[PDB]
Design an enzyme around this catalytic site. Structure first.
Site, PDB file in Angstrom:
ATOM      1  N   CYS A   1     121.226  59.847  31.981  1.00  0.00           N
ATOM      2  CA  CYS A   1     121.149  58.986  33.172  1.00  0.00           C
ATOM      3  C   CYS A   1     119.696  58.600  33.478  1.00  0.00           C
ATOM      4  O   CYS A   1     119.080  57.929  32.667  1.00  0.00           O
ATOM      5  CB  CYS A   1     121.833  59.661  34.351  1.00  0.00           C
ATOM      6  SG  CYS A   1     122.140  58.568  35.752  1.00  0.00           S
ATOM      7  N   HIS A   2     119.116  59.043  34.599  1.00  0.00           N
ATOM      8  CA  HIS A   2     117.661  58.846  34.794  1.00  0.00           C
ATOM      9  C   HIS A   2     116.815  59.981  34.241  1.00  0.00           C
ATOM     10  O   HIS A   2     115.580  59.951  34.315  1.00  0.00           O
ATOM     11  CB  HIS A   2     117.319  58.611  36.268  1.00  0.00           C
ATOM     12  CG  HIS A   2     117.913  57.357  36.815  1.00  0.00           C
ATOM     13  ND1 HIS A   2     119.149  57.330  37.423  1.00  0.00           N
ATOM     14  CD2 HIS A   2     117.494  56.073  36.754  1.00  0.00           C
ATOM     15  CE1 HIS A   2     119.449  56.087  37.745  1.00  0.00           C
ATOM     16  NE2 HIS A   2     118.466  55.304  37.340  1.00  0.00           N
TER      17      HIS A   2
ATOM     18  N   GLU B   1     121.546  49.677  38.323  1.00  0.00           N
ATOM     19  CA  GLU B   1     120.698  49.768  39.521  1.00  0.00           C
ATOM     20  C   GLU B   1     121.047  48.700  40.544  1.00  0.00           C
ATOM     21  O   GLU B   1     120.997  48.950  41.755  1.00  0.00           O
ATOM     22  CB  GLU B   1     119.200  49.686  39.172  1.00  0.00           C
ATOM     23  CG  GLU B   1     118.727  50.558  38.015  1.00  0.00           C
ATOM     24  CD  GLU B   1     118.809  52.056  38.279  1.00  0.00           C
ATOM     25  OE1 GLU B   1     119.493  52.482  39.236  1.00  0.00           O
ATOM     26  OE2 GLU B   1     118.209  52.806  37.470  1.00  0.00           O
TER      27      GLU B   1
END
Length: 239
Positions: free
Chosen positions: A139-140, A171
């Site tokens: 993910c991030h 996002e």
């Protein structure tokens, strides 16, 4: 596997109001829970850590849609191995980086704030990588690779490597693009660009998708967390 293989399961330490609806970001529950369970079932030992020893949950990740079934049972059962592990969560600097054989970056948007400067977690990652372990994130989570040089090369650890991670369009859908641009928070594509990596975009933002480049394994999103952990095992073992 055995407890001679120790996974450093990194969590973000950033836990603040973040979304337009006023809710907090932090650790996206199943991005910690799913990989914990995959590695546990495999037989590895798992050490949870954040850069401060503190964390909070991403409020969007605890809702019924994202936390349900057996996951929720595990989450709610204070005596579950997952919850025991949360109680045993450590500050990264209190750990010996040489103890770990896999680094796995769980995420949630909180990681955008701390992972790029989380030098102790980063040192565990490079120590793992430089002794032939596997370094991974979902993910991030790949924000951990931002500003991260590999001591063995003097170049960014992911220079010339393929990674994936949370999509730019994702996002937008979550309504955090402007927030990110104002905070100089880099999307994972941008992290790849900064470091000289190649970002591989999934067909769609919610796809179960991972990329393996040797001993670097990344995944896109909460939907990919299980597969990211499974593909870490694949890359790590011969089997």
């Amino acid at each position: 596997g055995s407890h001679m293989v120790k996974v450093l399961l990194a969590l973000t330490s950033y836990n603040e109001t973040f979304y337009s609806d006023g809710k907090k970001t932090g650790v996206f529950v199943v991005e910690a829970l799913h990989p914990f369970e995959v590695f546990r079932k495999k037989g590895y030992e798992i050490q949870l850590a954040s850069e401060t020893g503190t964390f909070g949950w991403d409020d969007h990740s605890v809702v019924p849609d994202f936390l349900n079934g057996e996951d929720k049972e595990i989450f709610d059962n204070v005596n579950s191995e997952f919850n025991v592990a949360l109680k045993n969560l450590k500050k990264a600097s209190d750990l010996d980086p040489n103890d770990y054989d896999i680094f796995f970056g769980s995420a949630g948007h909180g990681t955008l704030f701390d992972y790029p400067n989380a030098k102790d977690l980063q040192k565990i990652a490079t120590t793992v990588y430089d002794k032939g372990g596997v370094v991974s994130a979902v993910c991030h989570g790949p924000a951990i690779f931002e500003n991260l040089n590999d001591p063995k090369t003097g170049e960014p650890l992911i220079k010339g490597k393929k990674i994936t991670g949370f999509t730019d369009i994702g996002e937008d859908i979550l309504g955090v693009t402007d927030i990110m641009k104002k905070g100089n928070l880099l999307t994972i594509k941008q992290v790849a660009e900064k470091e000289g990596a190649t970002y591989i975009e999934p067909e769609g933002p919610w796809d179960n998708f991972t990329v393996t480049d040797g001993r670097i394994v990344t995944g896109v999103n909460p939907q990919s967390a299980v597969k990211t952990a499974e593909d870490v095992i694949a890359a790590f073992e011969c089997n």
